Amino acid sequence: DTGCAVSWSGKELKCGSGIFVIDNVHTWTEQYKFQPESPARLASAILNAHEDGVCGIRSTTRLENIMWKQITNELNYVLWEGGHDLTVVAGDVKGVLSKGKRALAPPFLIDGPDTSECPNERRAWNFLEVEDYGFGMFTTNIWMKFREGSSEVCDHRLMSAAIKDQKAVHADMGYWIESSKNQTWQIEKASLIEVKTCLWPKTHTLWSNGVLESQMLIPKAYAGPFSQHNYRQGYATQTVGPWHLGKLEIDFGECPGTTVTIQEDCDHRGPSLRTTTASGKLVTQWCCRSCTMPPLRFLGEDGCWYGMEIRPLSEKEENMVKSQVSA
Amino acid sequence: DTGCAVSWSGKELKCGSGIFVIDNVHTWTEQYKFQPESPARLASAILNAHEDGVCGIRSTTRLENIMWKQITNELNYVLWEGGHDLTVVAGDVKGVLSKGKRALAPPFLIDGPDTSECPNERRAWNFLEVEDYGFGMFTTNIWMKFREGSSEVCDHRLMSAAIKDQKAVHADMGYWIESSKNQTWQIEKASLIEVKTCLWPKTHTLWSNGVLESQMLIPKAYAGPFSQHNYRQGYATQTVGPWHLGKLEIDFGECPGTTVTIQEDCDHRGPSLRTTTASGKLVTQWCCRSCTMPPLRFLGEDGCWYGMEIRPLSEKEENMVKSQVSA
Amino acid sequence: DTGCAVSWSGKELKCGSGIFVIDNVHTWTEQYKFQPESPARLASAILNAHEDGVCGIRSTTRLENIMWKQITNELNYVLWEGGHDLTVVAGDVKGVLSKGKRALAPPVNDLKYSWKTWGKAKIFTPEAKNSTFLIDGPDTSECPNERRAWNFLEVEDYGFGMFTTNIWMKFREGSSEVCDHRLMSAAIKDQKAVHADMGYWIESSKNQTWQIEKASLIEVKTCLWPKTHTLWSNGVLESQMLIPKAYAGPFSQHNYRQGYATQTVGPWHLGKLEIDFGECPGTTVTIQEDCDHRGPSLRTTTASGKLVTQWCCRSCTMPPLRFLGEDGCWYGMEIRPLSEKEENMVKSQVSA
Amino acid sequence: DTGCAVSWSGKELKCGSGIFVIDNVHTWTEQYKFQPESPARLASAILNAHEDGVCGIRSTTRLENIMWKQITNELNYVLWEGGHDLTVVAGDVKGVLSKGKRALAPPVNDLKYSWKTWGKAKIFTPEAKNSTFLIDGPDTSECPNERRAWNFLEVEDYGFGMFTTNIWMKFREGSSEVCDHRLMSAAIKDQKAVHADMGYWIESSKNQTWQIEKASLIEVKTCLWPKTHTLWSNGVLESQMLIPKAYAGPFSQHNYRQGYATQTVGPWHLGKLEIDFGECPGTTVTIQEDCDHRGPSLRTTTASGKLVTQWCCRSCTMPPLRFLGEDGCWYGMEIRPLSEKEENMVKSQVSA
Amino acid sequence: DTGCAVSWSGKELKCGSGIFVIDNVHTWTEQYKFQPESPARLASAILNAHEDGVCGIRSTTRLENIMWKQITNELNYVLWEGGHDLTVVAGDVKGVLSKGKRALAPPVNDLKYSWKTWGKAKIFTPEAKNSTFLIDGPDTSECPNERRAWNFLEVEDYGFGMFTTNIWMKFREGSSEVCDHRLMSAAIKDQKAVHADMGYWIESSKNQTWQIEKASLIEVKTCLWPKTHTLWSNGVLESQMLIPKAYAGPFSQHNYRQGYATQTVGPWHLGKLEIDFGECPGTTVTIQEDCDHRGPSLRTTTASGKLVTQWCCRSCTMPPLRFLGEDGCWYGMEIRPLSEKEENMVKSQVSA
Amino acid sequence: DTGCAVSWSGKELKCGSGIFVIDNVHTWTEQYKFQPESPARLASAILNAHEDGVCGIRSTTRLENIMWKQITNELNYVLWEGGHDLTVVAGDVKGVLSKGKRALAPPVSTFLIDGPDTSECPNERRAWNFLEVEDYGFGMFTTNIWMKFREGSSEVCDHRLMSAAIKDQKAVHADMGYWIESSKNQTWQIEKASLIEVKTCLWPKTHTLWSNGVLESQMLIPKAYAGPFSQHNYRQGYATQTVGPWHLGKLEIDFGECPGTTVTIQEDCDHRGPSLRTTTASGKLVTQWCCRSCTMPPLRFLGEDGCWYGMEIRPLSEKEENMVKSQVSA
């Protein structure tokens, strides 16, 4: 990568050759697009998979559900060409991109809700692999292929990680986790356009030694890096965080029109709650036992949430908005 | 770091925001210049250390030596204005940058050849740290300051690391260690302008878990990353390599006129040997027990060196140039 | 601003930090995009304005009309799903951006809507309810400018990117007639000045005297240029500004040309304009003391289509003031026709 | 100025053509070089001035003093080659760049010389004495400032390059107290303004109000800032400008800070300065009504070497105004010491 | 052209002022875009030409075909609103851009209209009435090339921008068979030469001799390369230019190769080409004295898919000349096959 | 080359790959440095040249004189170790770079390197144009060029250091010491020229634009002074300037009026003749000149010692006997 870039402070301009890790969540251009292996090959894979007894697939990335929705009509036309008694529908997914326990062997509900006629316990998932990139400036494709065997680790050809001076980052096409040092290394921001379930490979992780699986702010089950940069002092793993929203924004600030204070006689740690009631009233009193300020805050689409270690003070959690993931 | 950069393939020009890790071991111009604090503090500290029982300092990087040789005259002038009987001699660096055992506290031969009159056990080392960065495009300055404590770890504000697709790198002002994926994550090349002895911080290290201190080609003693990218198949730690040459260019290949054949029977592991004898005869046949081709190849001021596994089968060790470092 | 540039003469390349004032009229890229607050806030504000008696909205910038046009459908959908009797109609801007006399107050106790962003699956509400909130359009009598809202938005931050960048707007806390200062700029260096804006680009230079030389106007505003963004704004007479103060002209002495006065009755009814000093194709102007006084601006092509060749001014300076538009070529108030019977020529529609 | 730049937030990359005002105090490269008229013309002008009664020259900028300390040997050689008694002496700048009251006129009857460029390793003509021409130097009585030449050079054109660039000078056609406008700049955009020249950098910003925030001065001048290069020049009161009008301070309302008045007795004798708002290391300032009136600026350390810890202000606004000089840290004219006593401290060496 | 560039070896960086000849064939994204004069003028010219016998237009470059195809709608709008019946159809280009014998003359009068730009006031214009003005298209017989316009436009000036720039075209005053010099380039430095164009990129180099090394054509013109833009244009024989003069080949000694002559019967019917010296995949070429005479170029693969492997040349110098078209890999006129015979293989459509 | 550049009008910023011809007279950096082969080969070559008659050498470019000055000291402390009685004497360049009729050969009572015109070692026994480039250094803040011996005699300048480019309506013929600019204003003709030195070799025709149909009596810069053999080297109304102020060295050819002087077009004037200066020997300015069939603005030569006119512009209100003329071979 040969080019120039101004520093974060904006007082120097440096040119040379190296590795340039670019934010792909804020693309500055058109979003990437996946390309299938072959039109007929995917049809044969679907045929022999449904012969093997699978009722569809689950998308691992939000850039693959788009491809499936694009090519479902052509695939169904190819199916009807051979007189096959099978139908494929490309649904939509909002929230966590749930994990399927099956795969797609090389040579039928796609995505959608938690249908009881096709449980996730036998639906294919995480069977693609990048093999080429291409060219272009305002638009670039991605050519995908099949995976040879079982793997629950996210594809590493779309990921990145870098550190320089006092600022690290763990980036892929749907995640952007930022870290910085102010007397200690801790996470400061995290922009999530999707919620995955595959594992972050340890070959693309900084500071991967001596990490407890309970200290990671982003849980290991939600493609959180196995790093000590994925850590905030005074908090624990947000297993029951508002991960059902889909798009999230992890920030350490204050939700508008609300105050948080530190009290020793506070409630314990449990499911996360929203700063608004079931009807639309605003709660303005919260407290934590041992948290550090500013408090953890998930800026969702429907409102503004807090972490698992923060509890309301002028409201009762019996009648509030509470996270729906393993409550 | 906002800017634009052309990709490795050269068919794509991508612009955006992120982190740009640039090669300083190979930059168009001298990009950085260490700048001291003041001629007063750096004279009172030197004097107080002199009555404290030290006889000099060892430089940690090859820019600190230039910094000392650029202000030794001002230090002498200030000290002589202070009315004392102390003289600082700003020497040079010969090969490896050995470490001292003392330090300078914030409120006299410097560098030079190893002299028993002023041993390393009575000498300071690694007492400076980065305070801020400067402005500019070609002649940026870096500001130094004293360390409150003591540490064997290198300064983390001068180091970097990045990974994208299948390409890793660990970089600082004098190191450029590249890695790549070809059926395995293993080292590809290295370019060492200097040879340090501090420890690479684990906050700037990719893939830091499950690492044994016997597989890293660059030893932990000589500031080699504690990473699994610092690895090559069939080799081990190069503790008796040509680290006395200073500048080095590690690469995998074959020097002209030579040939390596792998045979368990080959001589066991031993110190590295140059490809030319003292007279200048070109040895044209080597062997290794369990290495892997292409073989390890150190290139410096002496032309060609091989690793600790590539032994000569058509030559004896009676007249061979061997590594200066002893075990 | 950190970057590099090549000087006006083209023989130097300087890199550093400072302020870079870029021509946004000739953008080199795609235009900026105004992004409003939220479907719930705007719908509540419009509903409360209609309750108060506000009849409509007059746009302040040509970039705001596009935002209103793109959000009108979502506003109508929200106003219908809320169970209200109101429909929003967005027109088009033709000519001068007229000035309203009212404003929208910030909304309290906002309405209810699903998302926070703009753009989702919706339905087309029927054009009905017998109560319309007109946005822009022609000058009518059922909805006069005395009951229309004007200049009630302001920037709260900028976006990111190089080709397409978004600008996020909010509500003004008070009421003012001054243009928003977060979209304006001005610079001077050596012997060249500029007063920039999103739709204004006034150029000035020194040739034995500081005076205006060029002006590109892709819109005709009616707010006031803030004096914090004005160069050389002391001892300024309102009768000498080439661009009138009532059309967002800078209150500066760089907005001046020798021999000319304020162009109050110029061809401002066109919208887009290109002010420059030269000769229209096929015409000539001569200095004559017997020429009559100044009046409304006139076009060099009559209604039928013939060309007027001979012109003369009284005490103007050459080259003459010239306006370029889609209609044709115009002259300033001081240049008068000498050859074609001025009771036979097209004149400016601006009030005399 | 065609080029590319990134915004202050670093989130945008905007390319285009306009005016780029770059910092030259922190110039990222080598400084500009001033190139005079010619060895024959300067000698003629100096001889005519000496005949008229001008005893010396007082510089206006540091870049001109560097120019004068580079051509003295060639000027002396040219003077000696004509066969007349005069010796040119070049001094140094120590403090404020004072001002003279005479000037050098464009000389007719040019002297005799063959070369045009400067510098060919000439000989050192021995000082003839009995007649001297002093340039800069300490303030003496033999050649007082009332009989010195000042502000008689101006730019004619810039040079070329990226690192080393030359500026070509020429004699003025008259006498003026205003600084040369071809070395000055000013810009504003969004909520950031700046007034810049070759030795000044006055940055201003908006935070609930427009006021000065920083000022880097590597020289102290005495000419007047031209009002053609000044933003917001109306309604300016000379008693409210932070940087005084007598020290080339802009006649602008951006050159203003709330709670402070003009700093006429500030530490200008130092030369290089750094105006900032904050507390000097180890000191505290409290706003209490029982405080002394204004007075000369004082240093935080006594001449013995003791640091005064407590200071008090009457009606100013925090953070306090603070000057950064070569020797130490200074306060403004409103911050009075209550810990120590004024009479036992170092005050401003400038006259009241 | 002030800017910085990295040398050929990539180990350096140089900045300065001069002329930068940039490749417009492999340039990421399209960088230039033709702009016509006006809808009213073009329709008037079309009428005044159809009144004289002209029944179509042949394009000169492939950037003009795009302009014709994107502006052929407002022309029909003007013709339909004028009342006079005439329809314009814009086809595509096949192979070589053939040459016409007519030209559009500038209009004397004009047709009434209300716009000076393109992209407004169109419905469908649903009228043809068998009075067709055919722009480009296939080689028909109703309107032959002997009665069809060609090479009547020239560049007025260039536009502004970084990624896409507009080129403003205007009508020529007189007929000419030479290509427009204002869109061409040529540069030589050290041992590298190039003859650049909007669709041509011809490279030359020295390695013991000055001869062509690599050409890259995305179109095949028929005008003449001007000699003012040609390097080393003396002592040139028309029988030795590798690219023929009739195909806009430079009249230069850099357009030369040892052992080869003019390729008049080469594969010039493929449009895009890549002239190189080497072997098509899976073929061997040798030199034998008993080979037959010269002939048309032949593709390596028969229509059935038979890859001929044995080829020979009588006086050529290896590596052999080859063409890389869309269909397959070709050879030059001097390379005849030892296997098969020129009776059951595809020849070159170009013939006399 | 690969990079970005802003066009002449300043309205565009085009990036890509191609050939960038850069002005080397106005370098933006420090000038190139010639580097010889080795301190031993040159000594053998000069010794063998002095053996058979060659009494000296003449420089071809201004950059070769610098190299000879830098290397002569090492070349003279190598001539006494072998006992050979020969001491090389360096020198400076003033005026044109005169030609030589000999040439050193690759190696297997004084030597004069440049200087004034001395009958002790005439140009007919002086080597000239025997060095050529082998590779470059082309970058920032420093540049080096490595030279090597030339095989055969040649009167053509070394083509490695030359360039030429044309785009749109502007052409240029560049060099390490030449910068000739052409432009199209209703016709193609020369516009400017910045000769930091005057050479006497021939401009190669491989680096020349529009080389067909060229007359040797119309080239404004003569072909004997390394003028391009092109039709861009032409100005209407003027012929070849065989007798001009070439003895100055540095020149700047431009078209205009020298300060305080006026030139008109009348037919009652003297015919073509040597170029004259605008000031007399005493230093009195002349204000009236006239040309027979020239075109305006008039041809003007700018030197370090004054301002000159072309051969077709003669004075009228003064007598040429009191004027300083060009000191070249008429």
Coordinates of C-alpha atoms in Angstrom, one line a residue, chain B residues 131-314:
Chain B
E131 CA 6.7 12.7 25.2
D132 CA 5.1 14.1 22.0
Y133 CA 5.4 14.1 18.2
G134 CA 6.2 17.0 15.9
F135 CA 4.8 18.6 12.7
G136 CA 6.0 18.3 9.2
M137 CA 6.3 16.0 6.2
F138 CA 10.0 15.2 5.9
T139 CA 11.8 16.3 9.1
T140 CA 9.4 15.4 11.9
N141 CA 10.9 15.7 15.4
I142 CA 10.2 13.5 18.4
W143 CA 10.4 14.8 22.0
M144 CA 12.0 12.7 24.7
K145 CA 11.7 12.7 28.5
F146 CA 12.9 10.7 31.4
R147 CA 11.2 7.5 32.7
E148 CA 10.0 7.5 36.3
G149 CA 10.8 3.8 36.8
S150 CA 12.9 1.1 35.0
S151 CA 11.9 -1.5 32.5
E152 CA 13.4 -3.9 30.0
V153 CA 10.6 -3.4 27.5
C154 CA 11.1 -1.2 24.4
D155 CA 9.3 2.1 24.1
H156 CA 5.8 1.3 22.9
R157 CA 5.2 4.8 21.3
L158 CA 7.7 4.0 18.5
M159 CA 6.3 0.6 17.5
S160 CA 3.5 -0.7 15.2
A161 CA 1.9 -3.8 13.9
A162 CA -0.8 -4.6 11.2
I163 CA -2.5 -7.4 9.4
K164 CA -4.8 -7.5 6.4
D165 CA -6.1 -10.4 4.3
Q166 CA -2.9 -12.5 4.4
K167 CA -0.1 -10.1 5.2
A168 CA 1.3 -9.4 8.7
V169 CA 4.1 -6.9 9.7
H170 CA 5.8 -5.9 12.9
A171 CA 7.5 -2.5 12.6
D172 CA 9.4 0.1 14.5
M173 CA 12.1 2.7 13.7
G174 CA 14.6 0.1 12.8
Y175 CA 12.7 -3.2 12.4
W176 CA 10.6 -4.5 9.5
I177 CA 9.4 -8.1 10.0
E178 CA 7.1 -9.3 7.3
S179 CA 4.9 -12.4 7.4
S180 CA 2.6 -14.1 4.9
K181 CA 0.2 -17.1 4.5
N182 CA 1.4 -19.8 2.1
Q183 CA -0.4 -23.0 3.4
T184 CA 0.9 -21.8 6.8
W185 CA 1.4 -18.5 8.7
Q186 CA 5.2 -18.2 8.7
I187 CA 7.8 -15.5 8.4
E188 CA 8.8 -14.2 5.0
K189 CA 11.6 -11.6 5.3
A190 CA 13.1 -9.1 7.8
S191 CA 15.2 -5.9 7.5
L192 CA 17.1 -4.9 10.7
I193 CA 18.9 -1.6 10.4
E194 CA 19.8 -2.0 14.1
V195 CA 19.9 -4.9 16.6
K196 CA 18.3 -4.0 20.0
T197 CA 18.3 -6.0 23.2
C198 CA 15.0 -4.8 24.9
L199 CA 11.8 -6.8 24.9
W200 CA 9.0 -6.3 22.4
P201 CA 5.9 -5.3 24.3
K202 CA 3.0 -7.8 24.1
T203 CA 0.4 -5.0 23.6
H204 CA 1.8 -4.5 20.0
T205 CA 2.1 -8.2 19.2
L206 CA -0.3 -10.2 16.9
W207 CA -1.1 -13.8 17.9
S208 CA 0.7 -13.8 21.3
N209 CA -0.8 -17.0 22.7
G210 CA 0.7 -20.5 22.8
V211 CA 4.3 -19.3 21.9
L212 CA 7.4 -21.2 23.0
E213 CA 10.7 -19.4 23.4
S214 CA 12.4 -21.9 21.1
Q215 CA 10.7 -21.4 17.7
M216 CA 11.1 -17.7 17.1
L217 CA 13.7 -17.0 14.5
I218 CA 14.5 -13.6 16.0
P219 CA 15.3 -14.4 19.6
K220 CA 13.4 -12.8 22.5
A221 CA 16.7 -11.3 23.7
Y222 CA 17.2 -9.3 20.5
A223 CA 13.7 -7.7 20.5
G224 CA 11.9 -10.3 18.5
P225 CA 8.1 -10.3 18.6
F226 CA 6.5 -12.9 20.9
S227 CA 4.3 -14.0 18.0
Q228 CA 3.5 -17.1 16.0
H229 CA 4.1 -15.0 12.9
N230 CA 7.7 -14.9 14.0
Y231 CA 8.2 -18.5 12.9
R232 CA 9.4 -20.7 10.0
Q233 CA 8.9 -24.4 9.5
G234 CA 11.8 -26.7 10.4
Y235 CA 13.9 -24.1 12.1
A236 CA 14.3 -22.8 15.7
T237 CA 15.6 -19.9 17.7
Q238 CA 18.7 -18.3 16.0
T239 CA 20.6 -17.5 19.2
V240 CA 24.0 -17.9 17.6
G241 CA 23.3 -16.0 14.4
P242 CA 25.3 -13.2 12.9
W243 CA 23.8 -10.6 15.3
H244 CA 27.2 -8.9 15.6
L245 CA 27.0 -7.4 12.1
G246 CA 24.5 -4.6 13.0
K247 CA 22.6 -4.1 9.8
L248 CA 21.0 -7.3 8.5
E249 CA 18.7 -8.4 5.7
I250 CA 17.0 -11.8 6.6
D251 CA 15.7 -13.6 3.5
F252 CA 15.0 -17.1 2.3
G253 CA 16.9 -18.2 -0.7
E254 CA 20.3 -19.4 -2.0
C255 CA 23.5 -17.4 -2.3
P256 CA 25.2 -17.7 -5.8
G257 CA 27.1 -20.9 -6.4
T258 CA 25.8 -22.8 -3.3
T259 CA 23.6 -25.8 -2.8
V260 CA 21.9 -27.3 0.2
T261 CA 20.8 -30.9 0.4
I262 CA 18.9 -32.1 3.5
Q263 CA 20.2 -35.2 5.3
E264 CA 19.6 -36.3 8.9
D265 CA 23.3 -37.2 8.9
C266 CA 24.4 -33.6 8.4
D267 CA 26.3 -32.0 11.3
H268 CA 24.1 -31.2 14.3
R269 CA 23.0 -27.6 15.2
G270 CA 25.9 -25.2 15.6
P271 CA 27.1 -21.6 15.1
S272 CA 26.4 -19.9 11.8
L273 CA 29.2 -19.9 9.2
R274 CA 30.0 -17.6 6.3
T275 CA 30.0 -18.8 2.8
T276 CA 33.6 -17.6 2.2
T277 CA 36.6 -18.6 4.1
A278 CA 39.3 -16.2 5.5
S279 CA 41.2 -16.3 2.3
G280 CA 38.1 -15.9 0.2
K281 CA 37.4 -19.4 -1.1
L282 CA 33.7 -19.9 -2.1
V283 CA 32.3 -23.0 -0.4
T284 CA 29.9 -24.5 -3.0
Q285 CA 28.2 -27.4 -1.1
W286 CA 26.2 -27.3 2.2
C287 CA 23.8 -29.6 4.0
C288 CA 21.1 -29.6 6.7
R289 CA 19.6 -32.3 8.9
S290 CA 15.9 -31.4 9.1
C291 CA 15.6 -27.8 7.8
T292 CA 13.3 -26.9 4.8
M293 CA 14.1 -25.2 1.5
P294 CA 14.5 -22.4 0.5
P295 CA 17.0 -22.1 3.5
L296 CA 17.7 -19.3 6.0
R297 CA 20.1 -16.6 4.6
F298 CA 21.6 -13.7 6.5
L299 CA 23.0 -10.9 4.3
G300 CA 25.1 -8.1 5.8
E301 CA 28.4 -6.3 5.3
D302 CA 30.1 -9.7 4.9
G303 CA 27.9 -10.8 1.9
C304 CA 26.3 -14.1 2.8
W305 CA 25.6 -16.2 6.0
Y306 CA 23.5 -19.3 6.6
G307 CA 21.5 -20.4 9.5
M308 CA 22.4 -22.7 12.4
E309 CA 21.1 -25.9 10.6
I310 CA 22.9 -25.5 7.2
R311 CA 26.2 -27.2 7.7
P312 CA 29.0 -27.7 5.1
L313 CA 29.4 -31.3 3.9
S314 CA 32.2 -30.7 1.5

